[PDB]
Amino acid sequence: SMKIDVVTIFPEYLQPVRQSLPGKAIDAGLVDVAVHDLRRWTHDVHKSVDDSPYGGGPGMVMKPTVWGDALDEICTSETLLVVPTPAGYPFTQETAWQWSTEDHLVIACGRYEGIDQRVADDAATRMRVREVSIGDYVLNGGEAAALVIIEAVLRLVPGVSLLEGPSYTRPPSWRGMDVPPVLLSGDHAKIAAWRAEQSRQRTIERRPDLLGFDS
Amino acid sequence: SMKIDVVTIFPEYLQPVRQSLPGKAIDAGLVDVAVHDLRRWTHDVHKSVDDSPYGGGPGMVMKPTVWGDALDEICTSETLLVVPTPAGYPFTQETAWQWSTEDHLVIACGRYEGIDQRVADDAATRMRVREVSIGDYVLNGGEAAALVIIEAVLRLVPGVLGSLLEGPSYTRPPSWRGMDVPPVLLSGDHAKIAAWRAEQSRQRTIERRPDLL
Numbered sequence: 004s005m006k007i008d009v010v011t012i013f014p015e016y017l018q019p020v021r022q023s024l025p026g027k028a029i030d031a032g033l034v035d036v037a038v039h040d041l042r043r044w045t046h047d048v049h050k051s052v053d054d055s056p057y058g059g060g061p062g063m064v065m066k067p068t069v070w071g072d073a074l075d076e077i078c079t080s081e082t083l084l085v086v087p088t089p090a091g092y093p094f095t096q097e098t099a100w101q102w103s104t105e106d107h108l109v110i111a112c113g114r115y116e117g118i119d120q121r122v123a124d125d126a127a128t129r130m131r132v133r134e135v136s137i138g139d140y141v142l143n144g145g146e147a148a149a150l151v152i153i154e155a156v157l158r159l160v161p162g163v164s165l166l167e168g169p170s171y172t173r174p175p176s177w178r179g180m181d182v183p184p185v186l187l188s189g190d191h192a193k194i195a196a197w198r199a200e201q202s203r204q205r206t207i208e209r210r211p212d213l214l215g216f217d218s
Numbered sequence: 219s220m221k222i223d224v225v226t227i228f229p230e231y232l233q234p235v236r237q238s239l240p241g242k243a244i245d246a247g248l249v250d251v252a253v254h255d256l257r258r259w260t261h262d263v264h265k266s267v268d269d270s271p272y273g274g275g276p277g278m279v280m281k282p283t284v285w286g287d288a289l290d291e292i293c294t295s296e297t298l299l300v301v302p303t304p305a306g307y308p309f310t311q312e313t314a315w316q317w318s319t320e321d322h323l324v325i326a327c328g329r330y331e332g333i334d335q336r337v338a339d340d341a342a343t344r345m346r347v348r349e350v351s352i353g354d355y356v357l358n359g360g361e362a363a364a365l366v367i368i369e370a371v372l373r374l375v376p377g378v379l380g381s382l383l384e385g386p387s388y389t390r391p392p393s394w395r396g397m398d399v400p401p402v403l404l405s406g407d408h409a410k411i412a413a414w415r416a417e418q419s420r421q422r423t424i425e426r427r428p429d430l431l
């Protein structure tokens with residue numbers, strides 16, 4: 004049984020956890036996902052969570068005070084605090100396997116130009132903290148990255164390289180395009196070999212890095 | 219003017235997109251996002267969208283006849299068909315910039331075991347097709363990847379959503395739980411601040427992303 008808490012100023016954006024794979028995992032009781040509005044930990048009537056950056060720069064930075072109070076309430080020393088950010092360590096399949104065995108993930112979703120660095124620094128004095136990037140692109144906030152991380156982790160929880168090549172299903176001919184004959188041949192060895200080859204050939208074309216080549 | 223059509227068996231998943239859109243952008247006709255339930259194009263009373271893989275193996279493959287009908291209705295010659303898949307070319311910020319000037323994106327969300335490859339192959343004979351991965355991990359389906367792609371692309375379209383790594387950021391208060399904001403940031407020496415930020419970026423990139431150097 005895993006607990007996932009997500010902290011965000013847009014709790015509505017996390018509603019997709021209730022569908023597909025995470026929804027099934029929740030219904031099966033293998034995971035509990037709770038979404039928290041960060042503004043719950045504010046005290047002004049304006050419910051401010053952001054302020055201008057020290058040292059200059061565009062945009063706003065999320066205040067450490069509000070985050071600190073939120074994480075104080077939600078986290079324990081056993082928590083794995085996950086902070087999605089384009090500046091993070093890469094989140095990979097290996098990371099997903101690692102986190103699949105955790106009792107408690109707390110995902111802090113930033114907005115504006117990110118979260119005051121002291122939030123992660125302070126949290127790291129009492130729990131494990133992981134700032135991670137899900138890919139080399141910029142979002143407006145961490146919420147979609149939280150959903151990706153939850154999807155990647157939950158499908159690996161007990162109870163739930165190379166690129167996969169093309170797959171096919173019925174009918175054997177469609178619009179004049181035939182399924183590769185070897186796949187219809189029932190020869191397990193030949194099919195295995197063809198699939199292995201297709202995998203390695205797609206990998207060299209689409210992801211040469213995976214095989215130790217440039218680009 | 220960008221139109222995005224998303225096709226999925228989980229249309230409710232894509233609701234945050236529509237909710238993410240400022241009314242000003244919609245009323246100005248800058249953007250339109252539509253979500254379509256793939257089962258609209260099923261043929262049978264059981265609304266079947268997948269079937270066992272030829273050549274054997276685990277999982278299911280999505281049916282070409284269903285997807286072919288859906289894309290025939292939704293796509294035109296001007297469409298950029300986007301297919302999220304862990305087996306794709308990498309989706310990066312450069313991709314997002316490229317796609318931000320497209321008139322029509324159609325995002326085909328399938329299970330990771332895949333859509334029958336003839337769907338993309340057929341589509342590619344009359345439109346541009348891009349099979350892409352958003353990272354080096356497997357998701358059960360393309361829906362969360364579609365959310366990431368939509369957000370990364372649309373935030374680059376003026377007014378729609380409202381190298382080295384970035385270093386740390388700070389705001390008030392100047393001291394919090396025993397930690398002070400780096401005094402250089404309060405120095406009023408803006409050339410020095412820029413140099414300090416450059417070094418913080420260098421250190422963070424070496425530590426977290428040595429591949430970038």
Ligand SMILES: Nc1nc2cc(Br)ccc2s1
Nearest residue numbers: 087088113114142144145
């Ligand atoms: N690719 C990603 N972009 C962002 C932007 C913000 Br603001 C917060 C988290 C993330 S993860």
